[PDB]
Design a binder for this molecule. Structure first.
Ligand SMILES: [Cl-]
Ligand SMILES: [Zn+2]
Ligand SMILES: [Zn+2]
Ligand SMILES: [Zn+2]
Lengths: 217, 220, 243, 200
């Protein structure tokens, strides 16, 4: 098969600046009929891919004119003039001259809209979950940049560890911010043996570690 | 109004078979070829093959030759892909993607319209429907949500007031617990005041277990 | 008398259209008809004088506006495949007295499709007269063939030594469907030009068959490997052979 | 309602073509005839108001208001007259102009010296591609449509070399099948036994 190789796999860039992704093939891609079947697709979060550029330099209908392609032989390049918030996603270069069709690894676009702190929200477990012998406490960070955060759960001021998982959404289309959701899991038995429940949240967009808490159980 | 609408998500044990359908609307079905592309979770794209529904001509990726079966039914405007002898590393999203070449034109070598996709999970483990618990709003001057816990396999989908409420929501990537079952949270911010006004319900769907739950989320 | 543009137009489902109709007579009454093989002529809209309009027989998808006395355009909101037709603009004097004669404009041929990849230009070929026809009748017939075009919007013409010719020609009144069953089929057309044997066998005489095709514009978008099926002239030719 | 004589009317070159028209309401005042060629706009050719004849060139329109009947005769009918003729009627000076369905007229030429034959003609740029021409045949010989989906046959069309005094009919037929020569092409038509088939 033809291997496809994109240059930066992770490209962060501030709005209104130039962005440039390279792509490179193990062989030349000129079909016998004369055309060069090399393309560019973009995948946003929670969507299928969408064609931007086809046959090196042709923009697909709908695509803004700030996107453009070039190249010949083995080296090809996607260029964006003015990067905006809606450009966030994964950029794949593809080859269709020979069988089988092969894509590149993908290049993620991060936007360098800077510094913004989270809006924290603790949640006690529901009254109906507690019937079935388990208790889930949820700490919600919301709309923050950069992505780097740290959550420390504390129960009766005792730092808990290795009993909670966290999950994080992709960078948003509009505000260009992330959101996070940690979940401490305890038994019903152990839940009732304590009272003060809290998540401590450190982030470089905050001055001092904000913390939110409650008490029952 | 070109629309490609695929079959819902499924679960199959190792060594078995799965059959994904893709149904076209708003164009002449026989005019364009139909490719299939897959995506494993947190991975790139892989092309499997195509079927030209005019003449039944077929190409395939060497990797699947023997295992993959692409057919078509022109009367109902539907193309099929059937993969068999399923290994665990065939767990992925499977897309159908239309070629851009009308009537034997060379533009079929790139794709202009995709389907919504089909998650196929290969596992010996049992199917299980979720439990849905509220995340009641704080006693403080406003976020609430739904917690969908203990389901297998992926995926699920969450909406608010039958799809009416859409602004401010974040539905999180699922988390694989040590028990082998999946769990996620969906949340949403609303105005400080309007907890007494509005009546919020989350609509959870898990198709492999055939589960539909309409759970109220209100202060206590 | 009556002016009407454009002559031909192809359109995609959902697009919007504006049909221009001017007239240098000082007429008060102006109307729009449409003609389909089944029904015949059908009144869409009309205007008794400048500043007022009203609804005729089949008005649903159409909008009219009588601004000035001269002009009277017609507006299509969202094009449908039902609205594939020929549209005519008409005008009476409408004053209480003499000359109640209605005069029609040239007409506009409109075709609407689900997708514009179904439009193709015509392939054109000239076929030279047989040696047997020259021998048996002392005459020579050339034949022209316009093949595989869509939509049905074409004007065939014959040329000799750089000047157009009407004498001794005839073109088909109606074009053939290559695929008669399916209702979005491509089209074929033939024409002839007959000429004395002596004239064909002069090697200085040159013949040319032209087809003006009315398809897309440079504005319309195109994702296809083949060349954009734009408005163009395709043509083929033959010299006289002295054998 | 404006009702005309139906179908396509066939008339020999030089003969007279009769067209009728009848209307419903007695209040009708003006009466018009239009002439529409294939793929063109209607052209006004005659108009009557009072009862009786009105003659103009080879046209003769006639009106009788009592029987609510209108006519158009075409003397010495030429092949150029082949078109479809619309009848039109109004009550007022600004009242609605009600058209009729239309009556198609086909004027078949007088082929005095017929010599039916099927010739084969080759493409200018390819000896490979070729076409079959059925020509110089008598009027009242009808060419039928193709049965096969891959064989194309056009309908008969009338020619006129005006520098001479000669008119001929012609039909064209072609196909991409290797199973196709000019001998079999017009087998679906009933043609003269007379017909000339030269060597290919
Ligand atoms: Cl026919
Ligand atoms: Zn503890
Ligand atoms: Zn404890
Ligand atoms: Zn092999």
């Amino acid at each position: 098969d033809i291997v496809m190789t994109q240059s930066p796999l992770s490209l962060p860039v501030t709005p209104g600046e130039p962005a440039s992704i390279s792509c490179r093939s193990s062989q030349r891609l000129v079909h016998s009929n004369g055309n060069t079947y090399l393309h560019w697709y973009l995948q946003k979060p929670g969507q299928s891919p969408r064609l931007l550029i086809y046959r090196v330099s042709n923009r697909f209908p709908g695509v803004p004119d700030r996107f453009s392609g070039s190249g010949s032989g083995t080296d090809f390049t996607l260029k964006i003039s003015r990067v905006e918030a809606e450009d966030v996603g994964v950029y794949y270069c593809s080859q269709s001259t020979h069988v089988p069709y092969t894509f590149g690894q993908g290049t993620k676009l991060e936007i360098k809209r800077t510094v913004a702190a989270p809006s924290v929200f603790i949640f006690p477990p529901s009254d109906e979950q507690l019937k079935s012998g388990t208790a889930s406490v949820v700490c919600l960070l919301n709309n923050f940049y950069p992505r780097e955060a740290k959550v420390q759960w504390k129960v009766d001021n005792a730092l808990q560890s290795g009993n909670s998982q966290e999950s994080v959404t992709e960078q948003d289309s509009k505000d260009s911010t992330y959101s996070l959701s940690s979940t401490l899991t305890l038994s019903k038995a152990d839940y009732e043996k304590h009272k003060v429940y809290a998540c401590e949240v450190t982030h470089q967009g905050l001055s001092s570690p904000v913390t939110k808490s409650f008490n029952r159980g | 109004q070109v629309q490609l609408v695929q079959s819902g998500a499924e679960v199959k044990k190792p060594g078995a078979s799965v059959k994904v359908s893709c149904k076209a609307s708003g164009y002449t079905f026989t005019g364009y070829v139909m490719h299939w592309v897959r995506q494993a979770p947190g991975q790139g794209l892989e092309w499997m093959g195509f079927i030209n529904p005019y003449n039944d001509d077929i190409q395939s990726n060497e990797r699947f030759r023997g295992r993959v079966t692409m057919t078509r039914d022109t009367s109902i405007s539907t193309a099929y892909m059937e993969l068999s002898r399923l290994r665990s590393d065939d767990t992925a999203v499977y897309y159908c993607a239309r070629g851009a070449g009308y009537n034997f034109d060379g533009a079929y070598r790139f794709f202009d319209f995709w389907g919504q996709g089909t998650m196929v999970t290969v596992s010996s483990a049992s199917t299980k429907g979720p439990s849905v618990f509220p995340l009641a709003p704080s006693s403080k001057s406003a976020a609430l949500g739904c917690l969908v816990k203990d389901y297998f396999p992926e995926p699920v989908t969450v909406s608010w007031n039958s799809g009416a409420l859409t602004s401010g929501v974040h539905t999180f990537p699922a988390v694989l617990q040590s028990s082998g079952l999946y769990s996620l949270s969906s949340v949403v911010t609303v105005p400080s005041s309007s907890l007494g006004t509005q009546t919020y319900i989350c609509n959870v769907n898990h198709k492999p277990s055939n589960t539909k739950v309409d759970k109220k989320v209100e202060p206590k | 008398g009556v002016t009407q543009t454009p002559k031909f137009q192809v359109l995609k489902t959902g697009q919007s259209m504006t049909l221009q109709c001017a007239q240098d007579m000082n007429h008060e009454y102006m109307s729009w008809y449409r003609q389909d093989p089944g029904m015949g002529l059908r009144l869409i809209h009309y205007s008794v004088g400048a500043g007022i309009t009203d609804q005729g027989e089949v008005p649903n998808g159409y909008n009219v506006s009588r601004s000035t006395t001269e002009d009277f355009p017609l507006r299509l909101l969202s094009a449908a495949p039902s609205q594939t037709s020929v549209y005519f603009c008409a005008s009476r004097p409408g004053l209480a007295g003499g000359r109640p004669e209605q005069y029609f404009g040239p007409g506009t041929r409109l075709t609407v499709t689900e997708d514009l990849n179904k439009v193709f230009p015509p392939e054109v070929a000239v076929f030279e007269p047989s040696e047997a026809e020259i021998s048996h009748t002392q005459k020579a017939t050339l034949v022209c063939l316009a093949t595989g075009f869509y939509p049905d919007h074409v004007e065939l013409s014959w040329w000799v030594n750089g000047k157009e010719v009407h004498s001794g020609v005839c073109t088909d009144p109606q074009p053939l469907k290559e695929q008669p069953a399916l209702n979005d089929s491509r089209y074929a057309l033939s024409s002839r030009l007959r000429v004395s044997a002596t004239f064909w066998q002069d090697p200085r005489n040159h013949f040319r068959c032209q087809v003006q095709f009315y398809g897309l514009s440079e504005n319309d978008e195109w994702t296809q490997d083949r060349a954009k099926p734009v408005t163009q002239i395709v043509s083929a030719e033959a010299w006289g052979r002295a054998d | 309602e404006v009702e005309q004589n139906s179908g396509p009317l066939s008339v020999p070159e030089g003969a007279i073509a009769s067209l009728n028209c009848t209307y419903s309401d007695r209040g009708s005042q003006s009466f018009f005839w239009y002439r529409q060629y294939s793929g063109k706009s209607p052209e006004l050719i005659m108009s009557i108001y009072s009862n009786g004849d009105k003659e103009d060139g080879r046209f003769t329109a006639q009106l009788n208001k009592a029987s609510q009947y209108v006519s158009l005769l075409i003397r010495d009918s030429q092949p150029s007259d082949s078109a479809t003729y619309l009848c039109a009627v109004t009550t007022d000076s600004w009242g609605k102009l009600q058209f009729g369905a239309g009556t198609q007229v086909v004027v078949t030429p007088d082929i005095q010296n017929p010599d039916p034959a099927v010739y084969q003609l080759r493409d200018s740029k390819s000896s490979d591609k070729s076409v079959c021409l059925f020509t110089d045949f008598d009027s009242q010989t009808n060419v039928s449509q193709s049965k096969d989906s891959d064989v194309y046959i056009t309908d008969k069309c009338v020619l006129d070399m005006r520098s001479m005094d000669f008119k001929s009919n012609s039909a064209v037929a072609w196909s991409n099948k290797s199973d196709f020569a000019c001998a079999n092409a017009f087998n679906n038509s009933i043609i003269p036994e007379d017909t000339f088939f030269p060597s290919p």
